PDB file of C-alpha atoms and ligand atoms in Angstrom:
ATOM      1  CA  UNK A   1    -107.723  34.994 104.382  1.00  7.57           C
ATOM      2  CA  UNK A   2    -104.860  34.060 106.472  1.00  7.77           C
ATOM      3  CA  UNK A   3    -102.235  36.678 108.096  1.00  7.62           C
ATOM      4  CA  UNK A   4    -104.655  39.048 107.110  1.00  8.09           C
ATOM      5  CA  UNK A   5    -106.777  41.888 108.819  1.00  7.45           C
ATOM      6  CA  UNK A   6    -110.065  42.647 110.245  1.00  6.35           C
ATOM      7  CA  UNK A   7    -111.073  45.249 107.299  1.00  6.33           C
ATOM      8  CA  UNK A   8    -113.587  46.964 109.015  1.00  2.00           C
ATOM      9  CA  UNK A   9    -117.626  47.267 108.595  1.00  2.00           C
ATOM     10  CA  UNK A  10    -118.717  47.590 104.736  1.00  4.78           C
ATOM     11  CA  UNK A  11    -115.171  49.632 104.152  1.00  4.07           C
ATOM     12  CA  UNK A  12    -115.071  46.972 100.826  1.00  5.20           C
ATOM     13  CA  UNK A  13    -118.650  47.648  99.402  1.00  5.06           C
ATOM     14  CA  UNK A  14    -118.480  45.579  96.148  1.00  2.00           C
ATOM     15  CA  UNK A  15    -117.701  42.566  98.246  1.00  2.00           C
ATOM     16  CA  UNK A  16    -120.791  40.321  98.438  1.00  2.00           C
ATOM     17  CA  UNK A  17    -120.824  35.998  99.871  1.00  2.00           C
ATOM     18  CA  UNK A  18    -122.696  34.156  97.996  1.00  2.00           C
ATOM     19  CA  UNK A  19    -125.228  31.969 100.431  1.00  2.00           C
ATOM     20  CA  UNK A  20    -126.649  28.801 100.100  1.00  2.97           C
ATOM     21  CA  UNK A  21    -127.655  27.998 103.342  1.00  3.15           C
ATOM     22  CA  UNK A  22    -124.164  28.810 104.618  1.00  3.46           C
ATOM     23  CA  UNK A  23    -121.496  31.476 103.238  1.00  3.61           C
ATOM     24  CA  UNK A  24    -119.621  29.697 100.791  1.00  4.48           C
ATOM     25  CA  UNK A  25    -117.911  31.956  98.119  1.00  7.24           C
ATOM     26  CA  UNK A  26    -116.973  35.695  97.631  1.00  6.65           C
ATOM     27  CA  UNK A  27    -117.985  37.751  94.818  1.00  4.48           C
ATOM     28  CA  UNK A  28    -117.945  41.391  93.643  1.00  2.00           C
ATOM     29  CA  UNK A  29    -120.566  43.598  92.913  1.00  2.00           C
ATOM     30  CA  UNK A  30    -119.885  45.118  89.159  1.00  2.00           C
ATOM     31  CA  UNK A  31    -123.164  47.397  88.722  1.00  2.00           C
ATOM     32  CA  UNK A  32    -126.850  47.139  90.601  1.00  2.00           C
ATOM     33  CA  UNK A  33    -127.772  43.832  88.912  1.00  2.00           C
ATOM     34  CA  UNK A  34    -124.893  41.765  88.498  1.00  2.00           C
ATOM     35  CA  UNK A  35    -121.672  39.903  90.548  1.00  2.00           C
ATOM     36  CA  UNK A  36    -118.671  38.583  89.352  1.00  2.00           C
ATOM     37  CA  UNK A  37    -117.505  35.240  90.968  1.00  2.00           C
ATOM     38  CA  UNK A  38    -115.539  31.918  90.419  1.00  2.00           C
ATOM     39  CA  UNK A  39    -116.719  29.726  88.051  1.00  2.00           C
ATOM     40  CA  UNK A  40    -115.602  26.534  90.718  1.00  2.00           C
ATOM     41  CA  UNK A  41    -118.196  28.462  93.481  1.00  2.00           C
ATOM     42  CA  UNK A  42    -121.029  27.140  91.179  1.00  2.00           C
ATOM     43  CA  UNK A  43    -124.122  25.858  92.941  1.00  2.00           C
ATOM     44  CA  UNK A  44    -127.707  26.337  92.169  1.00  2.00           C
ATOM     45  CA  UNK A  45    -130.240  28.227  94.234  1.00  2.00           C
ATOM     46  CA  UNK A  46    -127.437  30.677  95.151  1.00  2.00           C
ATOM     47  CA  UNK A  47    -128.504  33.958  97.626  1.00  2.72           C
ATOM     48  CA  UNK A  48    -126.424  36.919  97.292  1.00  3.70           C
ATOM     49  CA  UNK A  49    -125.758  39.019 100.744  1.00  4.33           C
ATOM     50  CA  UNK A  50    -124.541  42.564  99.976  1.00  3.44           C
ATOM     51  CA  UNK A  51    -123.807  44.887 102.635  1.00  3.50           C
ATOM     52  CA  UNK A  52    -122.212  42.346 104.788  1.00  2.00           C
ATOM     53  CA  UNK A  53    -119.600  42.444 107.981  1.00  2.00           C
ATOM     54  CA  UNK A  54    -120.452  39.605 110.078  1.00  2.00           C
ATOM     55  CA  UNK A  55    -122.179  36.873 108.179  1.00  2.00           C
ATOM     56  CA  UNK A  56    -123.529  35.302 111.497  1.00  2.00           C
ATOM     57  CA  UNK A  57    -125.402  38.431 112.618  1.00  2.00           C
ATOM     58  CA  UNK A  58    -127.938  40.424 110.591  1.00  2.00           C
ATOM     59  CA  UNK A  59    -126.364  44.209 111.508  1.00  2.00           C
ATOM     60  CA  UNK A  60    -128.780  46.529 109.504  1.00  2.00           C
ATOM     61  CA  UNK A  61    -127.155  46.974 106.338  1.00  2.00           C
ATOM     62  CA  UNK A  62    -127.386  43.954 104.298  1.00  2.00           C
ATOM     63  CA  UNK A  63    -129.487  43.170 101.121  1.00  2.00           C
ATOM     64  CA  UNK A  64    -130.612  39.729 100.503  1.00  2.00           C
ATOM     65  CA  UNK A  65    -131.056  39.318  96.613  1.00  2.00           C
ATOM     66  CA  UNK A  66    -131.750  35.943  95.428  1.00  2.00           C
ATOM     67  CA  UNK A  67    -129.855  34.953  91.969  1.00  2.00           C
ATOM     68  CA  UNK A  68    -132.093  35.254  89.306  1.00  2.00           C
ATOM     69  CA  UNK A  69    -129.101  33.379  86.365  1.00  2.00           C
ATOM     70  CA  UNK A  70    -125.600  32.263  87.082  1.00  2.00           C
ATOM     71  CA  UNK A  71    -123.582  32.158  83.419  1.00  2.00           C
ATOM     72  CA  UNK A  72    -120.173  30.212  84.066  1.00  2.00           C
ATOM     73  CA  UNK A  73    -117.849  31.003  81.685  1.00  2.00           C
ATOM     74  CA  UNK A  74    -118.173  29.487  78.044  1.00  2.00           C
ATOM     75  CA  UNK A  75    -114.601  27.585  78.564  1.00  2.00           C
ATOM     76  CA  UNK A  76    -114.362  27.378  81.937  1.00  2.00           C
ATOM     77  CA  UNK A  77    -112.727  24.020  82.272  1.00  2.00           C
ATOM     78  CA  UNK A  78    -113.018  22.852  86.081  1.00  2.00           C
ATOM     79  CA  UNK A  79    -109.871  20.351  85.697  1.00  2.00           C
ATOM     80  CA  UNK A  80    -107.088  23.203  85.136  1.00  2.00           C
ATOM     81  CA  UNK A  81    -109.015  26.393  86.367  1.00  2.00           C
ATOM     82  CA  UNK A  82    -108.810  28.459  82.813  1.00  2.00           C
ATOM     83  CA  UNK A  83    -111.578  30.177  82.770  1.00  2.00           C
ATOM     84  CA  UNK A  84    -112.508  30.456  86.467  1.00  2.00           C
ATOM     85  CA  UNK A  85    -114.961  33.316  86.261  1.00  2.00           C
ATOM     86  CA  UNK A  86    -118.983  32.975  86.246  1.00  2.00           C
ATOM     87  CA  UNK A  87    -121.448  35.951  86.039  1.00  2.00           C
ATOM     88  CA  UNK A  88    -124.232  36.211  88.632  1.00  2.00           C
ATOM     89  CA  UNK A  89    -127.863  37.869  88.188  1.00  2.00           C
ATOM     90  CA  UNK A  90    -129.422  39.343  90.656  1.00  2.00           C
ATOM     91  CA  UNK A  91    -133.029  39.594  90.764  1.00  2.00           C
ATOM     92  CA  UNK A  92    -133.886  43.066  91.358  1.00  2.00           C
ATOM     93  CA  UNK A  93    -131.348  45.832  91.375  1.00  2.00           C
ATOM     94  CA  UNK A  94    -129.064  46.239  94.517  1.00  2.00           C
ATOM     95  CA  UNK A  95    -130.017  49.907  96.460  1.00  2.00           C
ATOM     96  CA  UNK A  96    -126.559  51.250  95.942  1.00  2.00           C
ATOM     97  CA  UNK A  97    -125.715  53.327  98.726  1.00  2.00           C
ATOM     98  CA  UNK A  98    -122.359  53.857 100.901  1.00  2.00           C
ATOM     99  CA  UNK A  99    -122.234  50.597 102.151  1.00  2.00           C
ATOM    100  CA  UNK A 100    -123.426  48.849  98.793  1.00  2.00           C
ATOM    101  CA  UNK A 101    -121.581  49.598  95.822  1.00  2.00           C
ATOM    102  CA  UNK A 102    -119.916  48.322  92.470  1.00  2.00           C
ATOM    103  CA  UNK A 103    -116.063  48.082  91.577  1.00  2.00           C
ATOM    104  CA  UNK A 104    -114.781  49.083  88.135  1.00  2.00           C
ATOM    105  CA  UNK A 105    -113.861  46.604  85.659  1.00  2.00           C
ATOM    106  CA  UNK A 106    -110.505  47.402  84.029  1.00  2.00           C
ATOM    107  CA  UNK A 107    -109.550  49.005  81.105  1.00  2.00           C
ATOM    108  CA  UNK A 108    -105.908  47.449  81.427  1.00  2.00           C
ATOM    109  CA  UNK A 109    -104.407  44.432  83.100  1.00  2.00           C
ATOM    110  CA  UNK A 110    -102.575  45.330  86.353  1.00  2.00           C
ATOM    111  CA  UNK A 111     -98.954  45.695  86.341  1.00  2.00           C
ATOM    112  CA  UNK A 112     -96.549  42.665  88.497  1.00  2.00           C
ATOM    113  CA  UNK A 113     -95.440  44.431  92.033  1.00  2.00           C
ATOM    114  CA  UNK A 114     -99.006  46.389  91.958  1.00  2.00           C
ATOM    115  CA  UNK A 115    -100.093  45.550  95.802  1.00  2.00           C
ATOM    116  CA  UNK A 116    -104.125  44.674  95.450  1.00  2.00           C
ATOM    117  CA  UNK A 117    -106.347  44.264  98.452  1.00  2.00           C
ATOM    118  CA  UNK A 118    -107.727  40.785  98.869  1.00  2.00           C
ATOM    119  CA  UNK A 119    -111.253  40.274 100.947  1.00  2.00           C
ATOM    120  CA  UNK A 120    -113.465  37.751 102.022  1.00  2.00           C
ATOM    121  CA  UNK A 121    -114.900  35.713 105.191  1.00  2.00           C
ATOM    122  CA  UNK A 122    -112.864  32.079 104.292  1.00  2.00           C
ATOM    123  CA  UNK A 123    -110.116  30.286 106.634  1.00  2.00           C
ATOM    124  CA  UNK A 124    -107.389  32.127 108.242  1.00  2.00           C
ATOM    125  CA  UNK A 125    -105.519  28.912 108.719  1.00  2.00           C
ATOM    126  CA  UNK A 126    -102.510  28.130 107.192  1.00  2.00           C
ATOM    127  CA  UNK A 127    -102.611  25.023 108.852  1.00  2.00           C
ATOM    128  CA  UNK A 128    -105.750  23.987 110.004  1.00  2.00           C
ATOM    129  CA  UNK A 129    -109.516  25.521 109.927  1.00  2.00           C
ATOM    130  CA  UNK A 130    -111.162  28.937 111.406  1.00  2.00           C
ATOM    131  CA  UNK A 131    -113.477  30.214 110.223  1.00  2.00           C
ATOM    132  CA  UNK A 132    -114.155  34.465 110.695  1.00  2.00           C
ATOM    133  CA  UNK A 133    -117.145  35.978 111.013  1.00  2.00           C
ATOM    134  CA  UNK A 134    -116.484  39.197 110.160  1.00  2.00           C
ATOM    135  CA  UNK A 135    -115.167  40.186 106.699  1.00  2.00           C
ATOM    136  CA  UNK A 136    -110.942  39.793 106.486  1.00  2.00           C
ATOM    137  CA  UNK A 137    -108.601  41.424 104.243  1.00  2.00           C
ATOM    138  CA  UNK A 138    -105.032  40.814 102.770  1.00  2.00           C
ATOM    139  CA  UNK A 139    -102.898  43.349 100.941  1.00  2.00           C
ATOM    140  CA  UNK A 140    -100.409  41.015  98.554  1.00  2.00           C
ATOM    141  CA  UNK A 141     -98.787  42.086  95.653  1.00  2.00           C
ATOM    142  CA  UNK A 142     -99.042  40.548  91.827  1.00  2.00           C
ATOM    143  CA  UNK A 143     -95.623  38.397  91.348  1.00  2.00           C
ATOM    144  CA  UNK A 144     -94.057  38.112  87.845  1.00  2.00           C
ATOM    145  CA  UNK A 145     -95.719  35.478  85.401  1.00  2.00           C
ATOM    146  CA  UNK A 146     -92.179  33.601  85.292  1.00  2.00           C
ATOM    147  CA  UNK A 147     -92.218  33.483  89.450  1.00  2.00           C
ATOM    148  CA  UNK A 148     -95.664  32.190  88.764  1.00  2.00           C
ATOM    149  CA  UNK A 149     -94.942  29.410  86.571  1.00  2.00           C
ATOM    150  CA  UNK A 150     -91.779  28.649  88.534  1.00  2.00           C
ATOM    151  CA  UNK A 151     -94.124  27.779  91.799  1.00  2.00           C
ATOM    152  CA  UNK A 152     -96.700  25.936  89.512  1.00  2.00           C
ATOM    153  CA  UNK A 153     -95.078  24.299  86.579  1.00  2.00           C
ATOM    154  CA  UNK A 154     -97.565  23.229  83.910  1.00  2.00           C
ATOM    155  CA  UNK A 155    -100.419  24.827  85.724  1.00  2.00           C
ATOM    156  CA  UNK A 156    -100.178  28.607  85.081  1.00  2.00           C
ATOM    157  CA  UNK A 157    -102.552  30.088  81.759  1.00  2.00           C
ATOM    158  CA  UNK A 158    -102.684  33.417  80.224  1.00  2.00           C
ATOM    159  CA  UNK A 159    -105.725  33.743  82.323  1.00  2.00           C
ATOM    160  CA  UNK A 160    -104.055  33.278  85.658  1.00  2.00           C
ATOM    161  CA  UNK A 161    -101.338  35.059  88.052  1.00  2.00           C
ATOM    162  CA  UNK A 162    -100.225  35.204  91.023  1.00  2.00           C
ATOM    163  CA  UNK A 163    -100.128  36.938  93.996  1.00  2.00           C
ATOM    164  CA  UNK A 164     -98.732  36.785  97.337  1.00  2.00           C
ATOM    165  CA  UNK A 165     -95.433  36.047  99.381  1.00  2.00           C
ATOM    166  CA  UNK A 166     -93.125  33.708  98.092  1.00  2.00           C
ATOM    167  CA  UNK A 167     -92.438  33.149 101.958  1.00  2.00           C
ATOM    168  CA  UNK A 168     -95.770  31.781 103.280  1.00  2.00           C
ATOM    169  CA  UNK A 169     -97.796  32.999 105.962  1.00  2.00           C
ATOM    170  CA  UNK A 170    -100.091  35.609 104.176  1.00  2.00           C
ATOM    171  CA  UNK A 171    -102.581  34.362 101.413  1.00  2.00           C
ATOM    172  CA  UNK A 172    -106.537  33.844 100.574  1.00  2.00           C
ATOM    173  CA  UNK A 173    -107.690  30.227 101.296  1.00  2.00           C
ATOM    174  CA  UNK A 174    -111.052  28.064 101.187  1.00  2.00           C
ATOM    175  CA  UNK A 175    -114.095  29.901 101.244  1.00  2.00           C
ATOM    176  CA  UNK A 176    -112.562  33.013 100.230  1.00  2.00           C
ATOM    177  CA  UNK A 177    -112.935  31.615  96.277  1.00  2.00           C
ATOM    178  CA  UNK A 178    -114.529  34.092  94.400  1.00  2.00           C
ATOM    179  CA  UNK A 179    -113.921  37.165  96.014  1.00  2.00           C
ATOM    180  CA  UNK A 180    -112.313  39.904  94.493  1.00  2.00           C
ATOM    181  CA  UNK A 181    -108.539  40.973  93.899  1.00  2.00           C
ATOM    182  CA  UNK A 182    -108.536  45.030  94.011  1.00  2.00           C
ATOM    183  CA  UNK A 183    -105.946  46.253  92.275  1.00  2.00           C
ATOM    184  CA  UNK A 184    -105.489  50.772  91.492  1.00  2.00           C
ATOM    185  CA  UNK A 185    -109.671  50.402  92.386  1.00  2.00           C
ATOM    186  CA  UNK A 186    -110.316  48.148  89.514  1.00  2.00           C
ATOM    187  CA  UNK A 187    -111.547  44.277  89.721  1.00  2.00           C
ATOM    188  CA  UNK A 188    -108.091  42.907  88.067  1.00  2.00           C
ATOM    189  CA  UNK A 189    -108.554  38.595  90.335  1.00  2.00           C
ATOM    190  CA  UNK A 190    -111.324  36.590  91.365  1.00  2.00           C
ATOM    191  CA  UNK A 191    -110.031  34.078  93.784  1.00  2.00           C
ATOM    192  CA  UNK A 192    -109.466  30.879  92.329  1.00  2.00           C
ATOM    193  CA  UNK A 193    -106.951  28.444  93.612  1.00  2.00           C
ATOM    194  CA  UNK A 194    -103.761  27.952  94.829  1.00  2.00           C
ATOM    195  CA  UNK A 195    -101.686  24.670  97.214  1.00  2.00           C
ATOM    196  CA  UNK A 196    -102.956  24.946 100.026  1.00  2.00           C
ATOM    197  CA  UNK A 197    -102.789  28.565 102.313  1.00  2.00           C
ATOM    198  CA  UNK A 198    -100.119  30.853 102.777  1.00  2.00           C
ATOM    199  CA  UNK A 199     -97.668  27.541 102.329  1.00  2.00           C
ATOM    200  CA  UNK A 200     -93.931  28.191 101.406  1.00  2.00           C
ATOM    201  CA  UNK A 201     -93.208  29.243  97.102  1.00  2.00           C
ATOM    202  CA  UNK A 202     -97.242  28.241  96.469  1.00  2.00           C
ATOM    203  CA  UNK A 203     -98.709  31.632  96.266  1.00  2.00           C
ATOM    204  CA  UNK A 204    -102.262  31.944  95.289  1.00  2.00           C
ATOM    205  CA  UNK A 205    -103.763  31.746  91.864  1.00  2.00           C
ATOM    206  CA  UNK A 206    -106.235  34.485  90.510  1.00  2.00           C
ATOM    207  CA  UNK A 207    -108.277  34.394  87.385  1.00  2.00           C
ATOM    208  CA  UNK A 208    -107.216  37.446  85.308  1.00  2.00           C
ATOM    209  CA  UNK A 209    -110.397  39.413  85.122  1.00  2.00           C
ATOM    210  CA  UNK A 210    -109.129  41.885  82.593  1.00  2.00           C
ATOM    211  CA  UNK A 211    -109.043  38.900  79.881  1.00  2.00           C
ATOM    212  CA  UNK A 212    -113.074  38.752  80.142  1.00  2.00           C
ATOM    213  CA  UNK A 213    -114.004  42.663  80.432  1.00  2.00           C
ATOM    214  CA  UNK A 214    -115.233  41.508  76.802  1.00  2.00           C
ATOM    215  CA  UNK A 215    -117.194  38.638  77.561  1.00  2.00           C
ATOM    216  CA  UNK A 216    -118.916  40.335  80.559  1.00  2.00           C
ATOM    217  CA  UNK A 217    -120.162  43.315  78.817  1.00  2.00           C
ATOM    218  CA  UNK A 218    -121.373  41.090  76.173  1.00  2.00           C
ATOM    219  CA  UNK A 219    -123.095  38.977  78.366  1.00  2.00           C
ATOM    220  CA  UNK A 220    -124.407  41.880  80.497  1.00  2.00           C
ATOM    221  CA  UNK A 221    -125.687  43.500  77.223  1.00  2.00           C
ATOM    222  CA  UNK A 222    -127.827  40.435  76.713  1.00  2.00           C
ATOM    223  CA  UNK A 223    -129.176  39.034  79.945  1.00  2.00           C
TER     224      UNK A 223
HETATM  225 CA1   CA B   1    -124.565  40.419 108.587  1.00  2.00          CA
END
């Protein structure tokens, strides 16, 4: 997250980093046994660390639940980003508690203007690479899907938008990809892509989780 804030110990308890090794991808806690994440944050043998602030530093309240199945979406197509969404197992049930603790899925699709809270532990660079320890967050509002389109021409899907500032300098970046977009306390992004961080009229790029509350309770229903 850059030109963002220090959130603040387990005060976003449906945000989980996905660990293979190393943080590298956000996710969202839906219910005890499942995460939503990118679809592009993809790797096998994936860990998922609930309860986190500083990823460096065991603090007390983490779980560590190994991923049991990761389900990427059935047209997720990795050249264009449609589709950017992927379901994650866990093995055994989180212990949800105050620190631990699912978002909603949405009913409706959030409205343009509608500031959302953006979280996770990637760069707060614009230019250049830092990495936090501790877990950042970003309040940006949804733009309109024509400002969208105007800053990536040709790019832009039904099941994208944007969000941001059209003048730089506040954004999500690398590392923060799928992590969640909180929007009226539903799930309504997963972070997905964007031109680089907090760069001038290249705001970033969020899958549109209310066009797959079908999908996931479909998929949850059967796995
Ligand atoms: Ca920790």
């Amino acid at each position: 997250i850059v030109g963002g804030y220090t959130c603040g110990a387990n005060t976003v308890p449906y945000q989980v980093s996905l660990n293979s090794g190393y943080h590298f991808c956000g996710g969202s806690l839906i219910n005890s046994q499942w995460v939503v994440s990118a679809a592009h944050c993809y790797k096998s043998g994936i860990q998922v660390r609930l309860g986190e602030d500083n990823i460096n530093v065991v603090e007390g309240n983490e779980q560590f639940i190994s991923a049991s199945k990761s389900i990427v979406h059935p047209s997720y197509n990795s050249n264009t980003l449609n589709n950017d969404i992927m379901l994650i197992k866990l093995k055994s049930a989180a212990s949800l508690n105050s620190r631990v603790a699912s978002i909603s899925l949405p009913t409706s699709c959030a409205s343009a203007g509608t500031q959302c809270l953006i979280s996770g532990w990637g760069n707060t660079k614009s230019s250049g690479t830092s990495y936090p320890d501790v877990l950042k967050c970003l309040k940006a509002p949804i733009l309109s899907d024509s400002s969208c389109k105007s800053a990536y021409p040709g790019q832009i899907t039904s099941n994208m938008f944007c969000a941001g500032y059209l003048e730089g300098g506040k954004d999500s970046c690398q590392g923060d990809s799928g992590g969640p977009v909180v929007c009226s306390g539903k799930l309504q992004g997963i972070v997905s892509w964007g031109s680089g961080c907090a760069q001038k009229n290249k705001p970033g790029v969020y899958t549109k989780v209310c066009n797959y509350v079908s999908w996931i309770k479909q998929t949850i229903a059967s796995n």
